[PDB]
Amino acid sequence: DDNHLSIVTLEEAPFVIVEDIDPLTETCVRNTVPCRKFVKINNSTNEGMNVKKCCKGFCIDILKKLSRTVKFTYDLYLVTNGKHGKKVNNVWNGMIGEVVYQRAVMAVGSLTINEERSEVVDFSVPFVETGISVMVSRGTQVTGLSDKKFQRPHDYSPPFRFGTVPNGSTERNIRNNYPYMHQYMTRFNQRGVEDALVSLKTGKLDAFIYDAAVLNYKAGRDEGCKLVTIGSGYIFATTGYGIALQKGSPWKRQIDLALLQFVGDGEMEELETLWLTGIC
Amino acid sequence: STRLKIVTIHQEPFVYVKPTMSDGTCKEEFTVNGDPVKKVICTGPNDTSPGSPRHTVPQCCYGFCIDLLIKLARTMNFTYEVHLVADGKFGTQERVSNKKEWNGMMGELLSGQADMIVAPLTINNERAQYIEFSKPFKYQGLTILVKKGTRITGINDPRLRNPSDKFIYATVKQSSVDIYFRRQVELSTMYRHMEKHNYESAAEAIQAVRDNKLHAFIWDSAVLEFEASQKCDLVTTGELFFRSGFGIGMRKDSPWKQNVSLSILKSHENGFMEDLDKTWVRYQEC
Numbered sequence: 001d002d003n004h005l006s007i008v009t010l011e012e013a014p015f016v017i018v019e020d021i022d023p024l025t026e027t028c029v030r031n032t033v034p035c036r037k038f039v040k041i042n043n044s045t046n047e048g049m050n051v052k053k054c055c056k057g058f059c060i061d062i063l064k065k066l067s068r069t070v071k072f073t074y075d076l077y078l079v080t081n082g083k084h085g086k087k088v089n090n091v092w093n094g095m096i097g098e099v100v101y102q103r104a105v106m107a108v109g110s111l112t113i114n115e116e117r118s119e120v121v122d123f124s125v126p127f128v129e130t131g132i133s134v135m136v137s138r139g140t141q142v143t144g145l146s147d148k149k150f151q152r153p154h155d156y157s158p159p160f161r162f163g164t165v166p167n168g169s170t171e172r173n174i175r176n177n178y179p180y181m182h183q184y185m186t187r188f189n190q191r192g193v194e195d196a197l198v199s200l201k202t203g204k205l206d207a208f209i210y211d212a213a214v215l216n217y218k219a220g221r222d223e224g225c226k227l228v229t230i231g232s233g234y235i236f237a238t239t240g241y242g243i244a245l246q247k248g249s250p251w252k253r254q255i256d257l258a259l260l261q262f263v264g265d266g267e268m269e270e271l272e273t274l275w276l277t278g279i280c
Numbered sequence: 281s282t283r284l285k286i287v288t289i290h291q292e293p294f295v296y297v298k299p300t301m302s303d304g305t306c307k308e309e310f311t312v313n314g315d316p317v318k319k320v321i322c323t324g325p326n327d328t329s330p331g332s333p334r335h336t337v338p339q340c341c342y343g344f345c346i347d348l349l350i351k352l353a354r355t356m357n358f359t360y361e362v363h364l365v366a367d368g369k370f371g372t373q374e375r376v377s378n379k380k381e382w383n384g385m386m387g388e389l390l391s392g393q394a395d396m397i398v399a400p401l402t403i404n405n406e407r408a409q410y411i412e413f414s415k416p417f418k419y420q421g422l423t424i425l426v427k428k429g430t431r432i433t434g435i436n437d438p439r440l441r442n443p444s445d446k447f448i449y450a451t452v453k454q455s456s457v458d459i460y461f462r463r464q465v466e467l468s469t470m471y472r473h474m475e476k477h478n479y480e481s482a483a484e485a486i487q488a489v490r491d492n493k494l495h496a497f498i499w500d501s502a503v504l505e506f507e508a509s510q511k512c513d514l515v516t517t518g519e520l521f522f523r524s525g526f527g528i529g530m531r532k533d534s535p536w537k538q539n540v541s542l543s544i545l546k547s548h549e550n551g552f553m554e555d556l557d558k559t560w561v562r563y564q565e566c
């Protein structure tokens with residue numbers, strides 16, 4: 001039915017957290033919802049199986065509220081072709097690609113609104129503020145993205161060691177804005193956020209440039225509160241996470257009004273306190 | 281076709297409003313960074329006392345939102361004429377009777393007196409039902425302005441939450457902040473206090489704090505932090521107790537809406553919005 005929607009998401013704590021289902025009873029309990037993940041049998045076949053999992057987190061709570069207020073049901077699945085979204089040889093992968101190519105009616109998760117994505121999908125109003133921030137060890141003297149240590153790295157001996165996790169909105173922005181910085185940085189590409197935090201804590205990296213909302217959450221949970229974001233939490237290119245819909249979607253209007261009602265009624269601040277607050 | 285009718289509102293540092301010179305032109309000035317200030321002629325009422333006739337005259341407008349307007353008009357290649365909202369208000373929907381009407385810039389956009397709102401206009405559910413908002417050109421929130429040396433912890437302070445006539449606080453009439461306090465029943469105690477004291481404009485409330493006639497002013501942090509950076513007798517307290525953004529406003533049938541939003545996103549991403557911050561918002565510090 002037209003009221004039962006295919007929805008794609010991506011694991012990224014604390015926005016989307018994936019757990020195993022109880023083998024018995026094979027049912028999702030507590031604050032979790034069913035979500036499925038296509039898992040390959042092997043690398044010499046296209047055969048796979050949809051493994052039943054359970055999903056929770058900030059964006060899952062938003063989805064549950066939207067489901068109730070906007071009046072839809074959904075079949076939630078985890079993207080397996082890439083991550084948030086990157087255009088490769090003019091073809092979008094990740095959550096963006098699932099929506100563009102009509103495999104999902106919407107994408108719900110830690111999906112950053114930017115200009116190039118907005119050309120191929122519609123975005124809801126932002127429901128979580130984000131941007132580009134810089135994580136360092138407390139006390140590191142870095143003004144921001146425009147710091148000369150980033151812009152002209154080889155003016156320093158030894159040079160500053162900094163990197164990102166490639167293929168998302170952050171790398172796209174640096175590639176477009178700071179060509180020399182970008183080509184320098186790629187030798188410090190990090191395979192994921194957990195690797196980057198280990199490189200910082202152990203002195204292999206001086207700075208980690210990445211999504212503000214994620215970095216703020218990791219800073220709040222850091223053991224010893226040693227890792228911080230620069231500028232009392234400054235953000236370049238402020239934007240937000242948004243729900244991605246197909247261009248011209250008939251769901252956008254009510255989704256937007258619902259999100260704005262949650263914000264205006266204090267419901268969003270509750271989810272922030274539930275999922276995003278940290279000790280530090 | 282036709283030139284876009286732009287409506288805006290006085291609200292420093294986003295929109296400055298000054299008299300024209302004797303010859304009808306705007307005096308040449310330079311920003312804090314030495315660049316010429318771009319100014320546009322904006323017509324609007326000089327008299328603003330409630331319940332009086334509105335005499336419109338050409339005036340000079342400039343600031344963060346005017347720079348943004350000029351950028352949008354260059355990018356999308358439209359012409360425009362700017363005017364100041366006749367009733368001086370941002371816009372709320374009020375009961376008359378069982379009918380409801382929009383006032384402020386909201387009312388002008390919906391009636392066709394304007395085609396686009398370019399102003400520090402807060403995106404909220406109430407307005408979004410009626411008009412199209414761009415993605416936010418500025419992320420900010422609400423905070424509280426007080427006279428330096430006034431001690432309150434923020435929105436949960438007992439002098440706000442258990443109020444009396446000894447400590448008066450308020451916001452601007454017919455504004456998004458008025459809507460916010462009226463909507464939430466958990467704020468009803470504060471709303472009933474503020475309703476007795478709300479001001480016709482942000483400038484008047486800020487001056488009232490300076491003059492010890494208003495003890496706290498609840499308003500947009502993008503404005504209040506700017507004032508506190510410029511006037512050392514004023515401070516904010518409690519940091520943001522609620523987050524929101526400003527957006528460009530258009531009718532739902534506007535042919536411009538897609539490209540306005542893409543232009544806003546592009547400007548955040550290429551540093552243009554940060555340039556505007558450095559020019560208009562973040563350059564003093566006490």
Ligand SMILES: O=C(O)Cc1cccnc1C(=O)O
Pocket residue numbers: 084085110111112113165166167168169170171210211214
């Ligand atoms: O910031 C990145 O490069 C990747 C990323 C990280 C966290 C949330 N969103 C995204 C995204 O590209 O949408």
